Design a protein around this nucleic acid. Sequence first.
RNA 1: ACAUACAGGGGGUAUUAAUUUGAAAAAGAAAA
RNA 2: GGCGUAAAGCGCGCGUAGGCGGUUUUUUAAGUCUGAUGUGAAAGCCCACGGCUCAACCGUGGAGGGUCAUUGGAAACUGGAA
Lengths: 224, 165, 202, 196
Amino acid sequence: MKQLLEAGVHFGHQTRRWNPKMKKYIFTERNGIYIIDLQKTVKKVDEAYNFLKQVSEDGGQVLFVGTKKQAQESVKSEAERAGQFYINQRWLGGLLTNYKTISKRIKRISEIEKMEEDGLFEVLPKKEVVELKKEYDRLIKFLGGIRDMKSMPQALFVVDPRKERNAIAEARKLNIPIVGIVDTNCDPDEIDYVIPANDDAIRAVKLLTAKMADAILEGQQGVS
Amino acid sequence: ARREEETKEFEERVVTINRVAKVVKGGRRFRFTALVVVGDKNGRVGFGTGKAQEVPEAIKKAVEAAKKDLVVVPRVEGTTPHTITGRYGSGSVFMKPAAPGTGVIAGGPVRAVLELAGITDILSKSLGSNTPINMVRATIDGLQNLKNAEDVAKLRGKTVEELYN
Amino acid sequence: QKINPIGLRVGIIRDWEAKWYAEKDFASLLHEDLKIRKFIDNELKEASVSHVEIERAANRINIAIHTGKPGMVIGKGGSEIEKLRNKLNALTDKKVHINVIEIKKVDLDARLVAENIARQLENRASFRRVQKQAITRAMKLGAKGIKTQVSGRLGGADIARAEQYSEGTVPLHTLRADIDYAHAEADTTYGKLGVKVWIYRG
Amino acid sequence: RFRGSNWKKSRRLGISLSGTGKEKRPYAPGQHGPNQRKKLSEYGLQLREKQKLRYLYGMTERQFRNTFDIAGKKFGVHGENFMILLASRLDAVVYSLGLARTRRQARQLVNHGHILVDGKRVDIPSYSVKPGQTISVREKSQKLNIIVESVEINNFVPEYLNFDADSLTGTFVRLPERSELPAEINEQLIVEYYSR
RNA sequence: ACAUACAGGGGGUAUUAAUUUGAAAAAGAAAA
RNA sequence: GGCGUAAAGCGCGCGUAGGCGGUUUUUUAAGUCUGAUGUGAAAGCCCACGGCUCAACCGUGGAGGGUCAUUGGAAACUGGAA
């Protein structure tokens, strides 16, 4: 669970062009923005605390997709706290449905390291080595933070989903469920696995992504 | 729309192969598009269109891109439960149910969908337009928008022996 | 135009097909090398020789024959090479010695599959089937890239085209790339179909 | 009357049309016989099933169409009912009792006069026997070596036909249900052909 | 309040021309 | 089946005839539904049975056919009256 009184600056909107499928979740209108109702926020948090726990006991991973500034460091620091994978910087266009040709680029972060022990340092000329170093820095940069993605992940977690439109577009087209902190203009109303909360600060991302980082933790310990 | 699906041994069927051009400086790069349905004859038909530089790679790509688009097709002893008119792209298809022993009376693309959907007993008429990707999309837009008996009588609260079959 | 890679890579990384010296006369060596290559061209109709290499040291020639079917230049146990060597001794009036080696990975060199694809197109097969099965049976041995261009009257066509099924790296401009090339003609009933096999193997 | 080969019009359609020996040359007739002959259309599949049902029983197609129109009057499934009307013909029963070795010998057997139904001399191969009739063998001409040759071979007389061989007089008992008619013809492409 | 693009009419910009009759780059797979 | 651009919205009003018309209550019965009787000839289509050696054909019997007429009911809707 969580608490309404834990939410200090964990409520509000960026109101200017809200979506009116988020008319049910507002509390009132205070100071320009639509502040968001916290009786149903904590209830959808504990419903997601059941849902991330109960489905993941047979080889179950989460994908922590947070690409937004002041939402990437929460996933970056809390995914390997949880022990899972994530994508903090540059979600790819095509990483879930396009896995048959990004299996080449989930392996070529390991390929380079299958050349460092058995001959890389200037046995080739100088215009291959620093270029392959730039390929390593870009494939630890633009890939995300995933390394052991063996299959398609059976769960997924998007953080700021109004900007990550192709993150929901590959999870909807592989019938894997989404968990999103739905801000204003998020089109999920049809799926009851969202979090009606606020992503505008480090703490407002952080305290509602940390519970879904530790939510699966309680899915490991007790039934495996 | 969802994941790749390989339940039964499916049966491919080529609806059309067209040679489509792209004019460049020089001659023209022309490809082969190949609208191919699949379906395993107990329900579960599904179409797909793929294009390539050569013809059997185009129908192989259309089979491997057709198996993600499998609709359910609820049916009753080889017959659709009711009459419909499936619409896409001004290319509509009338699909009337039938008795056993009357054949798939359907045209060119809609027979190639319906006779390997499991449905052997139907009366179609292709209204509108005779383009094969629109008639195939309109007969699968027919077949996915289709009511079973138990699904309607669990949708509303009046179940078995409430309405009339 | 596209130059051939065997022109570009003799004396770079791949050696010549003749190793001798001649300065004074010089036309009595190369033309006898041409007639001995034309005499190995008669047993190319069954034997499938890629290339012979002339090693004229001082008097006798240790000619190095490279066939992908090595058991049908030699006969049963060594008779056919000896009657062939006596026919070469008649037809160049010099001394020769047949040096045979047995080359497997037969679908990795260009001249064996170039004569094989020209043999299949002599026998009125369709060109796309033998082209795709040649490049996939050359990749299931393991190759680094196979261009295969057949050209001309394609399958008994009225207008000549150029059917090239390139696959993988055929990098003609990186000069440390040992690219095999062969063009073999196919004498079909509807004309003369030239194949062109360009295999890069690192 | 067909009157032609019935071997050459049985390698084209594919099924045997005599029962076994169609065999050593199974492709296709004609100058383009073995030359890897191509796919069939929807009309080619429906026409090959229609001539697989026509050239078996041997009729011309006006009699096949007029047997198809009086098969749609009856209460059942339509392509099955057409095959229970076609093998209730006097040609197919006088073959199917084993009174002749083949169906064209049964058409020459019934048409020249050499069977009777119920003691009446029927000289037509387009009589359709009703269930319950007896088929006689015309007592003057039942000592022919055609009939006592082909009755001496047992030919698997089916369960809708009782044959009494020493009297040479069989009854047509049942209407035949759809398992014991010729099984090498899909009936669904006949009824799909006559909506085209 | 600050940026870079697109929306439409208010009213902008006329260097100084002339074009050629008729056929041949057609186009295709179901399997091994 | 259409009418923005494909053929197609009168250039736009004022309006006569005509077409349609908000809610409730009572009543009637022209539309409407339901029933009976008369009638829609015979031949024909269709179904079934018999006679031609089968069929075509022929015959018998039933079904079907009207915006029909007379008449007994029902009143929710359209119409008439309050």
